[model samples]
Target: SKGEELFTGVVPILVELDGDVNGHKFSVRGEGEGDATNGKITLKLICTTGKLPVPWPTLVTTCVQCFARYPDHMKRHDFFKSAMPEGYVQERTISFKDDGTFKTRAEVKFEGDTIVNRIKLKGIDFKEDGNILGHKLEYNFNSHKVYITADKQKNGIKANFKIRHNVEDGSVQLADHYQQNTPIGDGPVRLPDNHYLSTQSVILEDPNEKRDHMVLHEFVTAAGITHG
Candidate 1:
């Protein structure tokens, strides 16, 4: 497509998703020389522009086999070209290592200004967040949710804590709180350290201006690697 031709496979991301996609909302989520991917999804304003899900996915292998004979008929067409992404929403490319093994599997889900770092890495999950000590809070990538109970023991709490997704609200205040207990709490778990944003509820709108982690950055980052 135009972007591929213009930027090629690797382009140092500096600025200009053109506001349609922020280059810096005053935040950086896994920004590096990471792996990459292409295209966008239209799952209701996942991006600033909203539901586009175009350029399509890789398609179902079984389905593709059924229509093998109709290659000429479906190849260039819409469904013919589109397929279901490998995982939730986007087909992320992870950061690569010298050995060829990826670090983890990741995907990004955008709902309006909301950005979900579908992290498949260990120590981080949609449900890996909390207000307890030791254990990091958990956030739900799919629903943008989290959970917290002041006095508890499990998970991160020594006694035992319930593994719950806190469905916090949007108008959440960032005042001293666990990342998950706040709004859009499900955004990213490897947060920029407490000194940065020590705070949310209600499917929070990304408070930052530019959110990083585009398609190309995912794959090489090891989007498929388990949190081992």
Candidate 2:
């Protein structure tokens, strides 16, 4: 009888972080049973909050439905609301072009001693619509880069990346998509040209500062388009 192989394992410690800040930890384990023909049955951690004494049902329900009913206003609300703390301020806007490229603006608030720093990423544009044939490819192919800086830095000192794909291509496409929590900044740093597209860096004046400032430089290249 051909049957799916069963496997089980446990991890006594699993640490999850939000950016460079430590967030939460978990004890993780799962069991699976299935056959080649029967398909595989599996269990996994779909979502989590760093808070101790994990809320199993709440996390599970949120994770299970995170991708459900995606691209709608509710999905967007859930994404932003869950990703940022009440004090974290974010402003993002986007525009589409006739040539299929798009532009975006993102601003984040960082509070620090003596001054409140505002990080702004401007003039970011994407090549073609990220959603191709109603499907979003991986982040590498569709994302654009932005540079960030702090008030204390003489030059723009940090860089990050952004990708904005068409979430609502059509009803069928929406069904295939999953909602994602809005990404929080990683703070500031520098990258070599070769590693440029793959990484981001954020800098703070002091580790204990309540807030910081950020600035982003936008860089993107596209085939067949001439830079004027």
Candidate 3:
């Protein structure tokens, strides 16, 4: 069976998201692909309401640039401790999946906030940039929440993204998240004026995004790699 009459490299998708992820908010509007042997998926921003801190071209670039992965049990404090120069703490059940590459959504999660970088995927753009500057990062996840503390001087951040799904759902999705954290108390990594991605950022957007828990289940219904 030959495909459509329109000859091209891609097929348009009107991706949409709705309904509660059980009780959590869910919404996603874009195009993406999942992995074969690895618990990962990449996406491109095809839609948004300006609430999302990412644009189109940037979305396309950020698409290949981000992802959320299935994680393994780890102490929140220790993860940040080893990842950063200072280390930290937290009592939350978290998981990880890092890709160690810049612009790659490492697919790690279970953070408290809506914005979590790809450290879990092992693909840390922030750490990558940090490393290029002779430094590294330190952070942790708290089940739909995340916290990362950085010294005032650290620059270049990780690939940020959002996720909302039940482990038993048989499917999930992720998007490039904007860097905006909720401020709280006297956390470390403070440097005077409010600036940059650092300090105690325990952010996790509940029912944060639509399709955020919807579309991917629809996507995985049929799809592959090398797809644009």
Candidate 4:
């Protein structure tokens, strides 16, 4: 039945989490039509989230060094009006389990006027690979949120280790590969400030080792969002 109705509309959009973490809102639509070896018609919607405690590694190290040193903070109203800090409010809760891992609970509200501060993340587990833009398929913590936006648009910053699998069976591995540096003010490549770029395109699913598989590796690197 269409892959069980695309896994039941992608498990509640990866355990829902609508808006307000400064400005966050979630959504995951579904529709089917395709073929898997003549299976015909196949739509999907696999969202994911989790493993994002501790202020999202200080908000991804100040938004990847403010988009690699003032690159217009990748646009979005000056990167949320200059590296976010206006009535800052962070909230997170993304949990999903069925083989593909996930876990996240980030709560930070400090700006006076009402809420203060809070952070509670339990059993953080995020590990899933690929499939986006058609029906969805991410799995865990959105694979470190698409490897921090593909390490900031292909080598700008944000890639300490958050890729659970894919990119060649490495499962997202990068613990300071000799300080792999890349980002010196490029030209065409924007996306930072007021960040919210999830055009979705992070797929990596190729490990059917003949079914029956189990491997767990909790990844975490503190200090400006994992890098070493």
Per-model RMSD to reference: 20.5, 21.0, 20.9, 20.2
Once fitted onto the true fold, the runs of candidate 4 whose alpha carbons sit more than 4 angstroms away are: 1-70, 73-83, 93-103, 108-118, 124-162, 165-228
Q: TM-score for all predictions? A: 0.18, 0.19, 0.19, 0.23
Q: Residue-wise lDDT of candidate 4 within 1-228, one digit each (tens)?
A: 111122112111111222123222222222222211221222232222332222221121111111111122232222211322221222222322222222233222213322122222232222333221111322323323222222354432232333232223334322111112232233333233222222112222237533211121112211222111
The positional error of residue 28 in candidate 3, measured at the CA in angstroms, is 11
When sorted by lDDT, best at the front, the candidate numbers are: 3, 4, 2, 1
Best-performing candidate as measured by TM-score: 4
For residues 118-188, what per-residue lDDT tens digits would candidate 2 score against the true structure? 22222223333334322342212123333222212321222333433333423111111111112344432
Model 1 poorest 10 in a row by lDDT: 58-67
lDDT leader: 3
Candidate 2, poorest ten consecutive residues by summed lDDT: 1-10
Candidate 3 residue-wise lDDT, 122-205, digit = tens: 123322232212212111121233223323333222213343321223333232243322212233422222111111112122
RMSD of 4: 20.2
Error of 2 at 5 (Å): 42
